[PDB]
Amino acid sequence: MENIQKLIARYPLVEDLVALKETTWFNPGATSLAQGLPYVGLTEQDVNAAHDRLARFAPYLAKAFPQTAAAGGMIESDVVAIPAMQKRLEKEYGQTINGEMLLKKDSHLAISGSIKARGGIYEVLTHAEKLALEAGLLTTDDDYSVLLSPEFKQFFSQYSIAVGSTGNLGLSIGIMSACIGFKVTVHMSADARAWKKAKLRSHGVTVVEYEDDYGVAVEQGRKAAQSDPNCFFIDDENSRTLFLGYAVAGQRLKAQFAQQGRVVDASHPLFVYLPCGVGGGPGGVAFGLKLAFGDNVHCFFAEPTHSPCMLLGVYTGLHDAISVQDIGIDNLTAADGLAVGRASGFVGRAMERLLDGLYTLDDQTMYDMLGWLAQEEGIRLEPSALAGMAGPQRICASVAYQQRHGFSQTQLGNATHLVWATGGGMVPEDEMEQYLAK
Numbered sequence: 483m484e485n486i487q488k489l490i491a492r493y494p495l496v497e498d499l500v501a502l503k504e505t506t507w508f509n510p511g512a513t514s515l516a517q518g519l520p521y522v523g524l525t526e527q528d529v530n531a532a533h534d535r536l537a538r539f540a541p542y543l544a545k546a547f548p549q550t551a552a553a554g555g556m557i558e559s560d561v562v563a564i565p566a567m568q569k570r571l572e573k574e575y576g577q578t579i580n581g582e583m584l585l586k587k588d589s590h591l592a593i594s595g596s597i598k599a600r601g602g603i604y605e606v607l608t609h610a611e612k613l614a615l616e617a618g619l620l621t622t623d624d625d626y627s628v629l630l631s632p633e634f635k636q637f638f639s640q641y642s643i644a645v646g647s648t649g650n651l652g653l654s655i656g657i658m659s660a661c662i663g664f665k666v667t668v669h670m671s672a673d674a675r676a677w678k679k680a681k682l683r684s685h686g687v688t689v690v691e692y693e694d695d696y697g698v699a700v701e702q703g704r705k706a707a708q709s710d711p712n713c714f715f716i717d718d719e720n721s722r723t724l725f726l727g728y729a730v731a732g733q734r735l736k737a738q739f740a741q742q743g744r745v746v747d748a749s750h751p752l753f754v755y756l757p758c759g760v761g762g763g764p765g766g767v768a769f770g771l772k773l774a775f776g777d778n779v780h781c782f783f784a785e786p787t788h789s790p791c792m793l794l795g796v797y798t799g800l801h802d803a804i805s806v807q808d809i810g811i812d813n814l815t816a817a818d819g820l821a822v823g824r825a826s827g828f829v830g831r832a833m834e835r836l837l838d839g840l841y842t843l844d845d846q847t848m849y850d851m852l853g854w855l856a857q858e859e860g861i862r863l864e865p866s867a868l869a870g871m872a873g874p875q876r877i878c879a880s881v882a883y884q885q886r887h888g889f890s891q892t893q894l895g896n897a898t899h900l901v902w903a904t905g906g907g908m909v910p911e912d913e914m915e916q917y918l919a920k
């Protein structure tokens with residue numbers, strides 16, 4: 483009634499969300515690592531176990547994917563300085579980026595060039611391990627390169643994987659599963675991009691299309707998998723296994739910074755800008771980053787103006803009890819990996835205290851910056867992977883965010899701004915030329 487409209491008036495940013503206006507929200511309740519940790523429900527030991535499991539699978543990956551052999555079967559991406567892009571952004575948008583801007587190239591991760599691959603590949607491998615252990619065919623002391631044998635491939639070919647996805651997660655699962663031996667079915671909305679559907683279908687992956695949203699595709703994926711004990715559902719909304727897979731990135735990045743001699747501390751703060759779809763990818767990475775760098779890393783989520791599911795969920799405190807469609811937002815965006823109308827739930831509650839803020843940007847901003855990055859640095863990405871690129875200027879422009887955290891412009895001169903590129907390596911020439919044309 484009158485109280486319901488009094489309640490809504492307490493959440494004025496929702497008006498801007500409905501109006502599709504680019505905005506930024508800084509979390510007034512962002513906490514220390516210690517204060518936020520209990521809400522995650524996962525520990526550093528859980529992350530260490532993920533690291534250990536990837537090291538067990540490293541001989542397998544080195545043999546199966548020889549491009550990783552020099553790194554010993556580790557799947558990791560470059561981190562590069564992008565100073566020409568930094569200057570271009572300053573020219574185009576008229577806001578100084580204090581400090582130094584870098585790009586984390588998960589767009590070019592080996593085997594499958596996406597942030598989602600960190601989790602997808604990890605989950606597939608974790609699941610294969612579980613099946614082999616419980617069949618009494620493997621122990622954690624065995625050399626996991628044995629799993630590449632025709633015998634083990636045959637064993638795994640008895641099983642299937644089901645997954646609801648916008649595209650990239652399915653691609654990474656399909657690629658790893660083909661090697662392991664699993665059959666795959668990807669459940670996806672009709673809204674998903676044609677080229678990602680075609681790429682799965684051309685590689686022996688079953689695609690089930692739904693005349694509904696991503697959320698329905700995931701739920702119908704769940705139901706289909708329940709019928710068959712040999713079918714395993716990878717749950718993009720709920721999987722802690724995916725989450726931990728992404729979290730591996732934290733210590734990897736710290737090691738890279740250590741190699742590059744790059745300092746992160748109170749006087750050299752690290753800011754990280756993460757594209758957000760359902761929240762699993764950016765949430766997991768953020769968790770790993772927080773464990774690695776503590777209170778000196780400051781994480782932000784970036785969403786399309788047409789799909790601000792996580793910002794809406796966190797800002798209202800409703801999380802997954804509300805969707806963007808609930809308030810008239812169409813969930814239609816060129817950032818197809820981020821076209822998720824309802825936030826994870828578990829990520830929202832687990833990670834909100836560990837996020838300094840969340841912001842939105844338009845498709846045109848993503849397209850413009852996509853072109854500029856190619857022009858300035860020679861790096862070609864998909865639209866979703868540009869969501870974090872708007873971040874450094876949102877932060878450097880906000881005097882009041884700097885007020886809240888005891889920063890200044892002078893202090894930010896010592897800052898590192900890390901834009902997390904989430905996809906681009908798997909994009910065909912025809913599709914990339916279309917993105918460059920806007």
Ligand code: NA
Nearest residue numbers: 758759789791
């Ligand atoms: Na989203």
